[model samples]
Target: HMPRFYLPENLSVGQTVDLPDNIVRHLNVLRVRPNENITLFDGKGKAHTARLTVLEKHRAEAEILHEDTTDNESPLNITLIQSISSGDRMDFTLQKSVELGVTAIQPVISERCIVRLDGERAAKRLARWQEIVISACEQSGRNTVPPVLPIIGYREALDKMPSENTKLIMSINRACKLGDIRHPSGAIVFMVGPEGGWTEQEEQQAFEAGFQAVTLGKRILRTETAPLAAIAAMQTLWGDFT
Candidate 1:
């Protein structure tokens, strides 16, 4: 299928809009000729059908053919609370998280985290991470671009946990399994740590805050692999996989 584009804001039906430079380059590189089918979305469940009206060297425009409310979203809503990792690892995490159907993401700076950013650097990093989420949405055919919240310390993140529901923390020593936790047929929050994983104190704080500790299996998985695996396993067990 031809990939769709995500415009999270300022989208209107039947209005001709200029494609952003990045998108223009993508179209050119992908050899999307004039009069080809394409899709655009506002990432709030509103999707539009359009035709490639103009494809120039540095720009492109599409004529909106129709608009519709998207119904392709998964029934289960997931929020990924991840400890920020270094470099491409964080990018990989955000990209895969969005593709796997997470509703939101919060990057936490935990005790064992080696990468740290503050002030303007943190803002730029968060924006960069959000772009990854949007790009993933475009590539994955998702009409919704999941929210990427501001980076915060682990303690600050813990204070913002949703009042009630299924909250999970990936734990190596914890005995609880995915099947053991009970979700109330709606939203779920998952917490995954950095390369060195969460400190004992951090895990204790999570447990104290009502975040249930769960293990994937016998073997230890990499930091990047754990979140995706947990999300897929959750979907398979409690979501549409049935």
Candidate 2:
């Protein structure tokens, strides 16, 4: 059977509703005729069986047949506090972070951050990044869409102190390995620096704020690769994969 599309909300069985613009375009492009079967998910762990009921030029409708609650999310709730990179780098980070089962993403503005946004520009960038997250969820077959927090300054991100578990700061100079640290019960927050890495003062500030510096390995990773590597490594260590 062909893979299904994602809707915006909980669709009850036997209910008929108008499809969103993107889904409608997909149906039209796929040449799905009336009565063709397709699946719908709300991006929140609920899947609905639906059949095409109407296919018009600008809109399409589907009649739901059944709905099921899908439990496919990871047990680990990893939150990445990444220093905002330039252009596609930030976008790529958000995309991969979602696919890696990240519970939340907090874009941090660091000392070496190459990209900067404020006012309307920041809002637009946030919206674009959020779109990338949603698209990634659809492609990765994720039921729970992770939350993306507003872009915050380095100092502000540290001030939050939300996570109770291991708050890690990835650094090449640090000798601590991920395996050496004990996992906490609640949330885990990992902070990754920009291309040039965090300044010494910045590192000291993070340490003072209760974040421990942990090295990934011998080699240094790019701004984008660092977060993904750290998240994957954590999942392999204390997460369900282990």
- Candidate whose lDDT is highest: 1
Question: Which number leads on TM-score?
Answer: 1
Superposed model 1: Cα runs more than 4 Å off:
10-13
C-alpha root-mean-square deviation, each candidate: 1.9, 2.0
Q: What TM-score number comes out for model 1?
A: 0.91
Q: Candidates' lDDT values, in order?
A: 0.82, 0.81
lDDT for model 1: 0.82
Candidate 1 lDDT, 1-242, residue by residue in tens = 65587765565667788888878988888888899888888888888888889989998998888886666666888889999899877888889877778888988899988875856888888888888888898888888888899888888888685677678889965648777777556678888899888888998898888888888887878868888888888878876555
Measured on C-alpha atoms, candidate 2 has an lDDT of 0.81
Which residue pairs collide in model 1, if any?
none
Q: How does candidate 2 fare on TM-score?
A: 0.90
Give a tens-digit lDDT track for model 2, residues 145-238: 7867988899989978665667989875544887787766778888988777889999889888888878778786765887888888877886
lDDT of 1 at 95: 90
